[PDB]
Design a protein around this ligand. Sequence first.
Ligand code: HEM
Ligand code: HEM
Ligand code: HEM
Ligand code: HEM
Ligand code: HEM
Ligand code: HEM
Lengths: 117, 117, 117, 117, 117, 117
Amino acid sequence: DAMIVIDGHGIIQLFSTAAERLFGWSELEAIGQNVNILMPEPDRSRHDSYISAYRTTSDPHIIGIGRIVTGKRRDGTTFPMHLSIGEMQSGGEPYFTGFVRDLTEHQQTQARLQELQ
Amino acid sequence: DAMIVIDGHGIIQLFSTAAERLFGWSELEAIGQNVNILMPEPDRSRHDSYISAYRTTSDPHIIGIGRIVTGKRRDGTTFPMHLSIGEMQSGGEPYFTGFVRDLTEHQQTQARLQELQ
Amino acid sequence: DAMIVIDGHGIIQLFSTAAERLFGWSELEAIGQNVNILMPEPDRSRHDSYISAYRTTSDPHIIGIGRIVTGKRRDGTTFPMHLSIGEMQSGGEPYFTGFVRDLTEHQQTQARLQELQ
Amino acid sequence: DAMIVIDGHGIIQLFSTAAERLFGWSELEAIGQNVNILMPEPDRSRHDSYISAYRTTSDPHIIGIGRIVTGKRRDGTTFPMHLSIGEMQSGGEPYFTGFVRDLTEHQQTQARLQELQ
Amino acid sequence: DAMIVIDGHGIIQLFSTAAERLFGWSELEAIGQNVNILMPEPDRSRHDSYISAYRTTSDPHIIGIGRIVTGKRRDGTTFPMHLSIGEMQSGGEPYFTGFVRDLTEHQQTQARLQELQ
Amino acid sequence: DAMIVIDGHGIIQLFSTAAERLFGWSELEAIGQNVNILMPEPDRSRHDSYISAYRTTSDPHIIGIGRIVTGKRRDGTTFPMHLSIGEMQSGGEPYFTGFVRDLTEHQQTQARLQELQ
Ligand code: HEM
Ligand code: HEM
Ligand code: HEM
Ligand code: HEM
Ligand code: HEM
Ligand code: HEM
């Protein structure tokens, strides 16, 4: 699956090839942008508050738990995806790694089985 | 899973043992019959048009894509199944191979999990 | 997954560690109790009749078939689980083995994919 | 896979259907016999010492670890199998559960791949 | 995996796309050729005798059993593969279906793990 | 599995929790060290030449191919592992991501099956 690394403020630092395939942004396009560009509203506007809340409280909601969420492609289409977040440290500052698993195929098979009785 | 081979007009040429188990027709019973006997209406009556449309346009809908569809047993019961279609040539004429995966178990587990809250 | 063994009257004889983790009862707590404590009503009150009906008729409903059912934890929360039942004999009397697979994760992933369009 | 339950002295108390298929002994034949009948020498003669050593020291070698060992069928043929052992208590005495996974297929595929260059 | 269909004399009748990828022969190249071109000697020269022996005796060695064998590519390189054979009838004559699973990756991983201690 | 990120000179920039578990080095201990500390000789001394050779030639040996290699823990024990390498760019410089899959379990099961006939 796809891999993204962000700094303590949600800025994309590293964007894997698979992330380019999934989200539609090239590495140069994605790096330097806030990770919130990869999700729809309301999560998009709230994303910084999610990171800030974790830095303040150290209380995890997805970190070490995982969660299926809605992601957004550059073309504006949305998709279901599983998200796991790793916490790292480099040069005195926090960095977060995001592993993204596209569940579009799963969602469609399930809806199709439901739709066929 | 089950395997069927048809000629360019939808006539069953080869019918595997697993196809006999799934559809309820023996090989001798199935061979020489149109593949449309394995599906309910409206697909059943439209099936020849689907094959003819592909021979004319060469524009695929399931070939090289795959699709979950409703199949029909000889006893008249229907079931969800995944279908993949391979295109072959033998003695100057087109033949199509169909690989069928019975998704009855999957559909029932899913409906049951949904029904139990 | 979890394993439980009961006598011909539904009394728990053996309760695996994994069963302790899933149901919330320790082995000493569970042993000597009727297996009906592991399920909600109406199955709970009917459970003895299910065992008695099998001893009389020898007609199986889950034995050698399997079934997804709702189980109940000691804290009173319910969960979906797959149940397989094995039939054994020891010292002239019937014993039944129950293999339990927790499908909570499966049910939640499915509901979540459905809820996200 | 196969399931066996023994008392604190290695006597078979319960023998699943799958264990009957794998080992070649029927449930009535197996129950009341020492579990050592299911393995070749030298493990066979040493088996009681393995159980006794655990009761004395409480130091596990397979319990909670697992191990691939050589098992023996009634017809005298041997096979590789994975063994996991669960420890239980019933009516003041220890009982042990053995889950057996036949690895014959695995061993043969591996030897065959090795033998074909 | 790859699929091939032969007549009662070992002549290739149908050759799937995946078979073209695995063996190196195109469908037109393969059709009309004996299936023995897909294996090295000594199996190659003996192959007709294997089919003839089955037609005479009806005693199976791979049919309904399966077997890992050495296959051969057009470029002359050999590889390990699993073979399953289905028996069919069409227009009064026997046809055989061969499902081929390339085990090159498996063999190499295994040899590599062995070579690294 | 484990994840490591290095700069264009083999210096560890990010070291995941799973990498800490596998290699035995904490993140602070690993960061700033050359990736060659994670492998035995001769690869260890040659590692810089492997990276330099890729920067010069752009000719891949593991990048986009994968390879099972011998890794080394801090305690000095070695293990078989599968390695996949991703190539990234950040702030005008190349970075490489390494995904490490511990194959110790696989190697031991295989050796054990071989050793038991
Ligand atoms: C692309 C789609 C994504 C969506 C829709 C999403 C959404 C969310 C949500 C709902 C939360 C928790 C808020 C709460 O429940 O109170 C969260 C937290 C967080 N996310 Fe994202 N996220 C996405 C991607 C990412 C990625 C790729 C990373 C890392 C590279 C990341 C880093 C974080 C961090 C560091 C937190 C705070 C820690 C925590 O609450 O566990 N997110 N996000
Ligand atoms: C048994 C249940 C089946 C059902 C319900 C079914 C239904 C369909 C549908 C919906 C289409 C596409 C029409 C469209 O979207 O415009 C199609 C096309 C086609 N099917 Fe079937 N099919 C079945 C089995 C098979 C089998 C077993 C074969 C081959 C042996 C086969 C051969 C073809 C061919 C050659 C086409 C045209 C190519 C294409 O559109 O990709 N079908 N079928
Ligand atoms: C914990 C949740 C469980 C639930 C909700 C449950 C429910 C049921 C149901 C619905 C039936 C069949 C009644 C019918 O369809 O007519 C049944 C039968 C039976 N159950 Fe349970 N069961 C549970 C656990 C167990 C366990 C762990 C065992 C064995 C240790 C067990 C032993 C049996 C036996 C012996 C029968 C009769 C045989 C048969 O009908 O196949 N049950 N149960
Ligand atoms: C059938 C083939 C079997 C073989 C070859 C085998 C062999 C062994 C070996 C090698 C040990 C450890 C001795 C040591 O390393 O010091 C052991 C221990 C033990 N085994 Fe077996 N065993 C078999 C089946 C079983 C089964 C089915 C059970 C339970 C039903 C069982 C119960 C135990 C117990 C309770 C111990 C002592 C606890 C421990 O050392 O972890 N064994 N066995
Ligand atoms: C390409 C590599 C292949 C090799 C090395 C191979 C080798 C063999 C061997 C060793 C036997 C059994 C002889 C014996 O043990 O006495 C056999 C039998 C047979 N094979 Fe092949 N085979 C290959 C492919 C195929 C394919 C693709 C088909 C069908 C399309 C096929 C059809 C048959 C038939 C019909 C028999 C006789 C039935 C039986 O003995 O079970 N073979 N082959
Ligand atoms: C820890 C055990 C490792 C071993 C034994 C190892 C060994 C090797 C070997 C044998 C080569 C290719 C030399 C050749 O065949 O000519 C290579 C190349 C390379 N490795 Fe490592 N490696 C390890 C870990 C890593 C990690 C974790 C990374 C990245 C974070 C990495 C980055 C690279 C790069 C960038 C190349 C050059 C590109 C290429 O040849 O494809 N290595 N390594």
